[PDB]
Design a protein around this ligand. Structure first.
Ligand code: 72T
Ligand code: 72T
Ligand code: CL
Ligand code: CL
Lengths: 187, 187
């Protein structure tokens, strides 16, 4: 059976951090659901790219659980994710079932907000470190992609391909990740 | 006055090659218009990401000319660009006025279709080389980003940041490109 990914899309999401993982995961044969936090309607991303989600979060939740829950960054997107009780419930469920949770840039700060994965080694965007580290609930890393326990994190738009390929490797294996990587013309 | 970019968005465009340049150019303070080839309606990209354009191409043309015309790739997107008389007119105008033309992945093959920039050194995705080189009208390059005469080309999703930053440098200068680059966490 194909692996399944939930990508939660909120107003102010970083569009590159949303699109790169969606696209790369789909190249890997993962069934990806782009789920609108606010509902079914189009979402205005951080740099004004407007993306139409596949489904509302409310509806996508009914079709869970997923092999990975993905939290894009963007400061205001991450803040919206952090404020959402629906996100909290999804992440708690995913944590309880020992499923992969992936977050990039400021996205990991929603893990802090929802008390997810405490004790894990994590990275974030450099400018989101202090927020993430408030209380010392995680151990900070400067690796471009980091993975500890359930929790896969990464730093910014420029680490999005590495982040996405790490998700691919976790779900579908090293060989599929290498096959998907080659045609991308990565450095 | 701010520089202005036209990004032409067709069905089957590679969404990463569309979003990365739009976002990075907007970070650079460029006024970017995402123009729908087919009209005002949302566009289904190659990997099923749906993007709502800012305007139809028809309308965006009325607001030209632009400092750069950008052609994303995606094989089927590039084919749609190649078949369009409206694209032909836009590119011919841009060429006639000695303005920048930028194209990535299979995007450069639309330049061939519309007889734009013959004689220039160009790159493409490796799998689009033979198409681009039919007739020997260009000189082929394996550089990740190439620039000759009016024509700025690049290879694939994994060269999209380099491509976008080259556009930024051409329009806004080296200093702005470096300022925009740093927070991206590129390697
Ligand atoms: C990143 O996408 C994010 O979530 N925050 C962020 C910043 C910051 F934190 F706002 F400064 C900068 C670049 C990229 C990202
Ligand atoms: C690229 O985005 C493009 O336009 N074509 C392409 C391929 C190809 F050519 F179809 F094989 C592969 C990867 C990336 C791109
Ligand atoms: Cl942001
Ligand atoms: Cl393609």
């Amino acid at each position: 059976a194909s692996k399944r990914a939930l990508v939660i899309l909120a107003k102010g999401a970083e569009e590159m951090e949303t699109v790169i993982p969606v696209d790369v995961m789909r190249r890997a044969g993962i069934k990806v659901t782009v789920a609108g936090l606010a509902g079914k309607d189009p979402v205005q991303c951080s740099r004004d790219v407007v993306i139409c989600p596949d489904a509302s979060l409310e509806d996508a939740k009914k079709e869970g659980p997923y092999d990975v829950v993905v939290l894009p960054g963007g400061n205001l997107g991450a803040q919206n994710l952090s404020e959402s009780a629906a996100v909290k419930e999804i992440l708690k469920e995913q944590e309880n079932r020992k499923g992969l949770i992936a977050a990039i840039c400021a996205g990991p700060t929603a893990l802090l907000a929802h008390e997810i994965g405490f004790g894990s080694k994590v990275t974030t965007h450099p400018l989101a470190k202090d927020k993430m580290m408030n209380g010392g609930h995680y151990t900070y890393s400067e690796n471009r992609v980091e993975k500890d326990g359930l929790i896969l994190t990464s730093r910014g738009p420029g680490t999005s391909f590495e982040f996405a390929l790490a998700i691919v490797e976790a779900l579908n294996g090293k060989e599929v990740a290498a096959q998907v990587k080659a045609p991308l013309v990565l450095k």
